[PDB]
């Protein structure tokens, strides 16, 4: 019963409201000058031979595949991201794994920045963690010496300019915001160039208020002029807590078994000190790991990605 596809549409604005796909595959093909909004979770999405489209894809349990597409603007979250035979794509991405391009040019990437009330649950139904996002991490299977088939969107890029909010009847029943501070996926710089070579690691442990804590912390650090590089969500075993936390592991061992930890990488001159001050004021009674100094933070971050890379590796 394939009312799970958009096929051969021109000059239209269509989409899907919550509960209307409920984790099924979705298919886009042969669409020109269309605005497509899929506000629900998907199994997987292929986009074939689309020209000058605006696409939003709610969380995708599997892969998102762009093939033979030109001048598309998208915001999407997915487990895998794949691109082939495409030109001039602009993507606001959340991806579990490494984004991949092949036989493509002018592909531009930015961090997923979107919100609506139903979205958080959709991520959950898609089995996608909002903290596992490697969006800047592109591998190009067909590099071309002397140039670059992909880049990053400027940080000052405003989401409205690439993926406008829907203004049709059907579609504004879904209450959307493209503000950084309301985004379900926290905004990460990934591999954006940095001015500072000071990082800070924070690890929060599973619990009902942890997610909220991560956000509040993120907001406090950004308020003081620091940057969020990366987030991670992974199981910490006792062995792993020893590698990362070292002779501070004892203090955290009790907590490791309630579920996955949440790691945050902060960046900026003074990051560790300022991070310590905030945690000390705003999370009394809540145990978190914060790097001791500028001198050890780098070590901290590496050890964490090391152990976590292997847990998520093959």
């Amino acid at each position: 019963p394939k009312d799970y596809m958009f096929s051969g549409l021109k000059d239209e604005t269509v989409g899907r409201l919550p509960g209307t796909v409920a984790g099924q595959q979705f298919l886009i093909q042969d669409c020109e000058n269309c605005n497509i909004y899929i506000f629900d979770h998907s199994a997987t999405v292929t986009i074939d031979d689309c020209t000058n489209c605006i696409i939003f894809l709610g969380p995708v349990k599997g892969s998102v595949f762009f093939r033979n597409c030109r001048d598309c603007k998208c915001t999407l979250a997915c487990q895998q991201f794949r691109v082939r035979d495409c030109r001039k794509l602009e993507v606001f991405l959340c991806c579990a794994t490494q984004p991949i391009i092949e036989s493509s040019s002018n592909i531009k990437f930015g961090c997923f920045q979107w919100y609506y009330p139903e979205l958080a649950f959709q991520f959950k139904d898609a089995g996608l963690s909002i903290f596992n996002n490697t969006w800047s991490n592109i591998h190009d299977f067909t590099p071309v010496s002397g140039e670059l088939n992909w880049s990053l969107l400027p940080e000052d890029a405003v989401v409205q300019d690439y993926v406008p909010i829907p203004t049709t009847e059907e579609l504004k029943a879904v209450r959307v915001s493209t503000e950084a501070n309301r985004s379900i996926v926290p905004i990460s710089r990934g591999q954006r160039q940095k001015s500072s070579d000071e990082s800070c690691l924070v690890v929060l442990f599973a619990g009902d208020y942890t997610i909220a804590n991560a956000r509040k912390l993120i907001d406090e650090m950004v308020g003081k002029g620091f940057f969020l590089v990366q987030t991670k969500e992974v199981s910490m075993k006792a062995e792993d807590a020893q590698r990362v936390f070292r002779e501070k592991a004892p203090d955290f061992l009790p907590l490791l078994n309630k579920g996955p930890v949440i790691a945050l990488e902060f960046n900026g001159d003074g990051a560790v000190e300022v991070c310590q001050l905030i945690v000390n004021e705003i999370f009394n009674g809540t145990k978190m790991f914060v790097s001791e100094s500028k001198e050890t933070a780098s070590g901290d971050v590496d050890s964490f990605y090391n152990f976590a890379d292997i847990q998520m590796g093959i």
Binding site: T44, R82, Q98, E102, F141, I314
Partner: protein
């Protein structure tokens, strides 16, 4: 000790299948650059599966693995009809390969958990598989996501080692 080659188009689910056989986490599987190796016990056999990257650009490396392959497992995205012709063509070229002559091939009609998923029936004769007489072959509907139907494929693999 059995040598398994895992091929099929990028995104068909080769690695997801490999990690299900080794019974491991499947939610952080990245597209494969290079290849992956895993030993798996089934039915009393030690299976060395070679999971090879399958995107168009790196298929020319497939050849360098044909050597001493006991079994070809070939994986298809059943829920991606658009690429039926492309996988159709890669499979036909494999079975022409001299170094793979006589090698039993199992086809996995993968992702049957999905809606657009074309049944093993349609794919089979869609690739006119019934005109393979060089070797023993089988089509197994499966889902590398849930692991359902996988064991049934592997049982046939053991039957034909």
């Amino acid at each position: 000790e059995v040598r398994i080659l895992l091929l099929g188009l990028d995104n068909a689910g080769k690695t997801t299948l490999l990690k299900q056989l080794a019974s491991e986490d499947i939610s952080h599987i990245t597209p494969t650059q290079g290849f992956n190796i895993k030993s798996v016990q089934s039915q009393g056999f030690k299976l060395n599966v070679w999971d090879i990257g399958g995107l168009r650009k790196i298929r020319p490396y497939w050849r360098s693995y044909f050597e001493n392959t006991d079994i070809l497992i070939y994986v298809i995205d059943s829920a991606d009809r658009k690429r039926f012709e492309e996988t159709g063509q890669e499979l036909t070229e494999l079975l022409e390969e001299e170094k793979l002559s006589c090698v039993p091939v199992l086809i996995f009609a993968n992702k049957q958990d999905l809606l657009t998923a074309a049944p093993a029936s349609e794919i089979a004769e869609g690739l006119n598989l019934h005109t393979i007489r060089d070797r023993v072959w089988q089509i197994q509907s499966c889902s590398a996501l849930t692991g359902e139907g996988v064991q049934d494929g592997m049982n046939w693999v053991c039957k034909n080692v």
